Amino acid sequence: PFRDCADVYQAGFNKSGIYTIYINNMPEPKKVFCNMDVNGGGWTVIQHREDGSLDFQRGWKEYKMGFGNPSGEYWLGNEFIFAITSQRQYMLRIELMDWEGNRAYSQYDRFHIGNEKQNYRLYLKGHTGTAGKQSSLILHGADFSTKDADNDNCMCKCALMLTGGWWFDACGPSNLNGMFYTAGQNHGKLNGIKWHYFKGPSYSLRSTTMMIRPLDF
Ligand SMILES: [Ca+2]
């Protein structure tokens, strides 16, 4: 029973696309995009953005259950992210592109997130890549927050200032779920789709993909 796109790959489907996966302890299947091209393939996409067609200003429940479509932009849903990352040890890669043709990535040796009663707190270790030398996600641990669930480390409400659902600190150095600003708009925006150690706190990115695979791939 395919638990993730790593399984899908090892069974010989080497072509990127929509696949269905059967996550342990989850009542129903789930479609995901599998990227089979990137490291040596194997990647379950957990979020993707590229055109702004999908709105990321959603509440806790939509963040939990997922929204959008794996043929385009989407958020896989926290409950599923937790569930997949409970099945084994996963690593996380984050593909990013700016408006001038540049591609960069961040990678994490180890990723998982807590369950809902842990506010889906992020845990990460082992940052490398070309999207900056420091990690733009906090490594040390942050809750997940959205407009209706204020779980950040700030006295202010970060999801309200920056939009979207994210592991905000006192809003920290990233928000890949902010507002999508188009070509030539990407400049001077404070609540865009940002990764501070790549392009900075006021650049809005052209495109993001967050994906996971097991260490033993
Ligand atoms: Ca707060």
Curated annotation (Swiss-Prot):
UniProt modification remark: Glycosylated.
Glycan-carrying positions: 14
Domain of life: Eukaryota
Cystine connections: 5-34, 158-171
Fibrinogen C-terminal domain mapped to chain residues: 1-216
Localization terms from the record: Secreted
Leftover remarks: It may have a potential therapeutic utility since it can be used for specifically targeting tumor vasculature or for promoting angiogenic processes in certain organs such as an ischemic heart.
Binding partners and assembly: Homooligomer. Interacts with TEK/TIE2. Interacts with SVEP1/polydom. Interacts with THBD; this interaction significantly inhibits the generation of activated PC and TAFIa/CPB2 by the thrombin/thrombomodulin complex.
Job description of the protein: Binds and activates TEK/TIE2 receptor by inducing its dimerization and tyrosine phosphorylation. Plays an important role in the regulation of angiogenesis, endothelial cell survival, proliferation, migration, adhesion and cell spreading, reorganization of the actin cytoskeleton, but also maintenance of vascular quiescence. Required for normal angiogenesis and heart development during embryogenesis. After birth, activates or inhibits angiogenesis, depending on the context. Inhibits angiogenesis and promotes vascular stability in quiescent vessels, where endothelial cells have tight contacts.
Name of this protein: Angiopoietin-1
Organism: Homo sapiens
Gene designation: ANGPT1
Section of the entire sequence shown: 282 to 498 of 498
